[PDB]
Design a protein around this ligand. Structure first.
Ligand SMILES: [Cl-]
Ligand SMILES: [Cl-]
Ligand SMILES: [Cl-]
Ligand SMILES: [Cl-]
Ligand SMILES: [Cl-]
Ligand SMILES: [Cl-]
Ligand SMILES: [Cl-]
Ligand SMILES: [Cl-]
Ligand code: NA
Ligand SMILES: [Ru+3]
Ligand SMILES: [Ru+3]
Ligand SMILES: [Ru+3]
Ligand SMILES: [Ru+3]
Ligand SMILES: [Ru+3]
Ligand SMILES: [Ru+3]
Ligand SMILES: [Ru+3]
Ligand SMILES: [Ru+3]
Length: 129
């Protein structure tokens, strides 16, 4: 599923992200924009052999199982395919674990490079929330 901006902002708030670990909703919308262009089916293979899945491009080295990432963990306890669903529950739940891991949203390199310190409230502007 390809979400609209405000549709995903609304969904993310429904699912508990609105200021989760102190990151405002626009930070989450911004990160999903540049990680996946709001496409839940987005996948991208990394140089290390791991793959990134879903709206927030969550990686198989640490967070999910895809059966083809040697030496990896599965800390969210989910098949990576769960992260591709029209229903963002598994991505959001796993994202809550990732942002709690120590480095906050810097865990998403695209968030650090493209969202951090910017006017992220723009991403929720206009939306009925
Ligand atoms: Cl729901
Ligand atoms: Cl907020
Ligand atoms: Cl915001
Ligand atoms: Cl694996
Ligand atoms: Cl699995
Ligand atoms: Cl949902
Ligand atoms: Cl933080
Ligand atoms: Cl703004
Ligand atoms: Na894994
Ligand atoms: Ru808010
Ligand atoms: Ru709010
Ligand atoms: Ru990535
Ligand atoms: Ru950890
Ligand atoms: Ru860790
Ligand atoms: Ru502004
Ligand atoms: Ru609401
Ligand atoms: Ru409201």
């Amino acid at each position: 599923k390809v979400f609209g901006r405000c549709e995903l902002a609304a969904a993310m708030k429904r699912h508990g992200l609105d200021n989760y670990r102190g990151y405002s909703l626009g930070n989450w919308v911004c990160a999903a924009k540049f990680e996946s262009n709001f496409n839940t089916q987005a996948t991208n293979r990394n140089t290390d052999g791991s793959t990134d899945y879903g709206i927030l491009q969550i990686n198989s080295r640490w967070w999910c199982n895809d059966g083809r990432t040697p030496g990896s963990r599965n800390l969210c306890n989910i098949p990576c395919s769960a992260l591709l669903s029209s229903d963002i529950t598994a991505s959001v739940n796993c994202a809550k674990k990732i942002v709690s891991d120590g480095n906050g949203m810097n865990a998403w390199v695209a968030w650090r490079n493209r969202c951090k310190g910017t006017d992220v409230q723009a991403w929720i502007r206009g939306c009925r929330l």
